[PDB]
């Protein structure tokens, strides 16, 4: 698992 940064930040 891997938390996307997007958001937030994009």
Same mark, same amino acid.
């Given at each position: 698992?891997?938390?996307s940064p997007? *958001? *937030?930040f994009c």
């Amino acid at each position: 698992g891997f938390r996307s940064p997007c *958001p *937030p930040f994009c």
